[PDB]
Amino acid sequence: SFFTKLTADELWKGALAESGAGARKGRGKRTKKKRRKDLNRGQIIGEGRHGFLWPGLNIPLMRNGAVQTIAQRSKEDQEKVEADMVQQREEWDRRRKMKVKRERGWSGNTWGGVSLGPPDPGPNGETYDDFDTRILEVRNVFNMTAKEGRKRSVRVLVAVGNGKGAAGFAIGKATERADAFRKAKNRAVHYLHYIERYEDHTIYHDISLKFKRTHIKMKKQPRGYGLHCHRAIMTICRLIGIKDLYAKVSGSVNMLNLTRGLFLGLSRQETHQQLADKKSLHVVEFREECGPLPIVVASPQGALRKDPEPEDEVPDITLDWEDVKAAQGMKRSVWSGLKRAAT
Amino acid sequence: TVDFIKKQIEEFNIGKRHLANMMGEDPETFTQEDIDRAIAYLFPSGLFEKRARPIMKHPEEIFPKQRAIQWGEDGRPFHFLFYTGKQSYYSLMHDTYGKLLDVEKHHNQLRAKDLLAEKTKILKDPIGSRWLIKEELEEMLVEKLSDQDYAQFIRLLERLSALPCGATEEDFVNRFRRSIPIQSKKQLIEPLQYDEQGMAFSRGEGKRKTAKAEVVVYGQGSGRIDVNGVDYLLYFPVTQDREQLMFPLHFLDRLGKHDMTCAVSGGGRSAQAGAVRLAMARALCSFVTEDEVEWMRQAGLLTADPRVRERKKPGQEGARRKFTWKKR
Amino acid sequence: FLHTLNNVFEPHVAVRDAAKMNIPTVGIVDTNCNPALITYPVPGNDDSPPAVRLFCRLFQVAISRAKEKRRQVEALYRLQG
Amino acid sequence: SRYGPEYKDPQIDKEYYRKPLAEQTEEEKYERDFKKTQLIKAAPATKTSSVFEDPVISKFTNMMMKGGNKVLARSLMTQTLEAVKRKQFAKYHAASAEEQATIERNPYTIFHQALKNCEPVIGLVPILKGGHFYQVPVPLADRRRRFLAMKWMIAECREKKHRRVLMPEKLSQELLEAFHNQGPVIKRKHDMHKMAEANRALAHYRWW
Amino acid sequence: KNRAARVRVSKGDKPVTYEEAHAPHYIAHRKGWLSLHTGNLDGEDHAAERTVEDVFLRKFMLGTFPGCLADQLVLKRRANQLEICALVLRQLPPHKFYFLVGYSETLLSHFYKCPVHLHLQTVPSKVVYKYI
RNA sequence: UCGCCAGAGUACUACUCGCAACUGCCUAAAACUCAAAGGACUUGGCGGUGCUUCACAUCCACCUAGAGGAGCCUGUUCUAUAAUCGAUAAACCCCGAUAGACCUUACCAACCCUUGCCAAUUCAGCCUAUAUACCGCCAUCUUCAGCAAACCCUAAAAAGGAACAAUAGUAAGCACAAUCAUAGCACAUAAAAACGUUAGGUCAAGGUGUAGCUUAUGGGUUGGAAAGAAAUGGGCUACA
RNA sequence: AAUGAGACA
Ligand SMILES: [K+]
Ligand SMILES: [K+]
Ligand SMILES: [K+]
Ligand SMILES: [K+]
Ligand SMILES: [Mg+2]
Ligand SMILES: [Mg+2]
């Protein structure tokens, strides 16, 4: 029955059954990963159960200048050699069950907040080791096809940043999740924004914007209290470099709109120097802990206007009801003042 | 890949020297045709694909034409149309259009001076001139083209060629001209043969539907045909079969002016009758003037019949008929 | 850009793409063009043949002088040391 | 089809080539036939330049053939023309002075004339409209009328003939019957005219 | 769809050698026969014995050289001597190759009662014809 | 500035006030049930939707020879016997079989054998169950032209990506194409035909996952699987 | 030309 035997690749290609019709449209819900074991991982050409020492294969051909001859092995010696092989195989099994504990994202199973390392180098040889990327949203996308039917595709939305004020985002979609990450990282560095940071810890002024159907409001904060924002905003803020911010999200909480709305609002930020130039007047910062000391932070380069600003007795500004309610001390929710973990 | 080509060139010359040394010929005249017959002998590869046989030729002819480097060390492109995607095609278009303006400008000056010294040389019908094929043109510009681009380029040449032609322009145009082979349907008239005091006898070959006929016609005898040593009337009882033999002779009005002996083997009665008919038509071309030979072709006498019995496909009752198809 | 519009009266793709690649553009803009993305717009006429020829010649001498005066200073630099 | 699109139908008539100088346009037709170097198909076995053949006879001979017996079909057609000739010769002898130069003794003339009287003038084709079929008369083309006349001749002599009477003699009788406008085939032709005339108001259904 | 001795297309990351890259209908058109002998001629006998011996060598050479075999063997039968041509990767030390060469030549000669020739050509890795 | 809106179904309903209404109008809940209901959009399929164009064995018009009727041969279903299995819309039905008197043979009835083919083995052996675990080898849409990977674009991207007097796409891989075979070419026929669809067919070519048997679902000997009430498919010979 | 789908994501 020697002719009845087959090749190792043929046997494993059939035993695994990873090419049939079961694994096409989710028909196979086994959920247990069948593992293929290479039976040639441990090989000693010449070694056998009977224990024959063939000169040339296992034992050296020449011993002390004399060529060895064919010889057998002692029963006790052969037992020890066989005991060595089985322990090696048991060790291999122990090194396969264990799995590397990946970085903990926003949760234990989602990919939100998981870093993928530095982006791939550009075609010109430029290397980006300072940039870091984070995953914001992974979602399976299905499409209806004439032949296959449900064509499952994976799209991801990642953001990159160096921590010095430059960051960007992009979306990458492919048939495989592994290929999806690669496309998202490379296309991210092509779209980069520069977000001005007042003293490299906070935005210059409070920002209120409405991107499509997403209402996001951000407020300036001192150095002590920082990074109290949406868990997706915190991921972007750490990449940009902002370390003190408060943000409240109202309306739709879609990840794509929130990311676009945040960058659009931050890219529209106005600095003190620009405000001084367009007004031709000095801007004075009144620190509360420094008393009534008039610290000057920016000066209008060029002509200085001698005409003071017209003082309006009652300013005409649009106030948000949430801001006034909190200021007067009427927000008594059981979630606003809760103690949380570190930033 | 310039260096790789250079390495192939030098070792091919060295390899040619070794082949000449082992073949025992003169290495100075070891031509490519000699190399092909030498390789076909040392390595007798039996394969039906003509391109799959072992080859050893000039690396320039083997390796496809490669694009040269388009920019210097500083990155500046050498040509001024490199940013158009297809520099070679558009440069040719730019030069071709520029020649048209120069011809128009030159013709305008000639009209001002009241002189017309140019003539239309587009008509090259006796030579058999045809424009470049798209595949041939792509191998001249070393760049891929499209059907829309090819048609535009050819039509532009027609405008250039329809204008008065200059000496420089014709040299430019003639690079885009190709000559077709000689086209003719005249047959080769076999000269008459004389043998052992026999005058005006010719031999013809005919074959139709697995039946080969050998007919030799004597121009000095009366009207009779001897097939396989027996009279044609006995050998062809069917009226239709004997009508086939009449068809060549009757068309030439020489039914009784030729004595023939025939030898036909294989096939049925009609296959032999058709084969003998074809052989006589080819054999009688020697005795007939050239003008009526053309008339012979127009009647279908000289054209062999390509209709042969087809095979039987596996899974079918016959050559085309299939088994009964029960829908349910 | 001697003409910022294509043959279908739409803004040229190169105008938008150049801004993406951060490439400054000097283009002649007609009365129906969009000078928003062009960093050095030149409001003028791009249809009459005399206008088009004038712009080409002006950029011919501007380039030639730049090429020549680059060479003249290089010659002076070579004899400096 | 082993013949490509370039191949054309050969010309067989010898007289077409022997007198070309009396016309100019026809000269341009065949001088360019070979000047264009167009290939010519092989001569068919059935057709020949013999002056004693006739195209209508070959088509009629082919239809009578069953299976692949061309010799038997040719033999039957030969006897049928002979059978008609014998009957016409016999009737000529037993005739008066004025009757002698009335009878036609040419079987080819009789055969050509017989078919030209059995051809229907207007045919019928079913048309589906409103879930029902209406027999709508149509002006059948010449080739269809010529083909239909031959089929009626073959169908009549094959079906309602006696077992003893031979095929060549039975067909000979019908040719004479059709030559006098009194054969059953002529009756069948009139019957098709009866149905076509009755449905004369349904001709508006057809759209061609 | 035909599946006899074919490798299916899977993106462009799986290398294929020349033998495996051609469908079986290309035999005698693009690639020759891996074995040549007189048994399958027109009027020659002794065809079944050659076939079974051929199959055994396909299984013996594959197991004698585990992993280091590149592709299929080539078997040539001249007179009564048997020639085996193989492509072997650079896996075993040259001492082991000569040991196996001597072991194979002697064992097969005394089993089929005919002289055996074993010629080896060594390549750095499997030769790739398409994809990759 | 006024009116109206607090998940869906129950509900333009029950009860209540007013009304020339009396099967009515207006006002308008709850018990209970569900974890959704609902707006817009994208691709695909489909349409007894419209417009234009087209079927060279093809749908109609139309050509020739046949099946369905009878005998016989053979294959299924049903009937029958103690007495296989598998195929069984197109893609089953002279099919696995280019092949069964014993053998083959896997079926039945009896009668024997328990390291029971091999060098060894607390192991050999299984035509035992699972084609819904599979490799192999195919059917099929199909002589349909589209599939897949790299990359770019879209005031966002579910997805889509062409205008030649060109308006966002690019170059390669597979398939078609070309080439090769049928001893000239041509034509024609063969051969080819990707990614997928039908959990299509095949544990009974063979191998093998999982489950089962182990003095028995294993091995051997002898004898025997009859029979056609009836129905049907594909064929041969005819009805001259 | 009326009807049909169950334990496929
Ligand atoms: K659609
Ligand atoms: K039948
Ligand atoms: K038995
Ligand atoms: K099994
Ligand atoms: Mg399968
Ligand atoms: Mg967890």
Ligand SMILES: [Mg+2]
């Ligand atoms: Mg939500």
Ligand SMILES: [Mg+2]
């Ligand atoms: Mg037939």
Ligand SMILES: [Mg+2]
């Ligand atoms: Mg204008």
Ligand SMILES: [Mg+2]
């Ligand atoms: Mg609300």
Ligand SMILES: [Mg+2]
């Ligand atoms: Mg409710």
Ligand SMILES: [Mg+2]
């Ligand atoms: Mg109502």
Ligand SMILES: [Mg+2]
């Ligand atoms: Mg009511």
Ligand SMILES: [Mg+2]
């Ligand atoms: Mg109430």
Ligand SMILES: [Mg+2]
């Ligand atoms: Mg049909």
Ligand SMILES: [Mg+2]
């Ligand atoms: Mg019959």
Ligand SMILES: [Mg+2]
């Ligand atoms: Mg019957």
Ligand SMILES: [Mg+2]
């Ligand atoms: Mg029957």
Ligand SMILES: [Mg+2]
């Ligand atoms: Mg059965």
Ligand SMILES: [Mg+2]
């Ligand atoms: Mg069954």
Ligand SMILES: [Mg+2]
């Ligand atoms: Mg059993």
Ligand SMILES: [Mg+2]
């Ligand atoms: Mg299946």
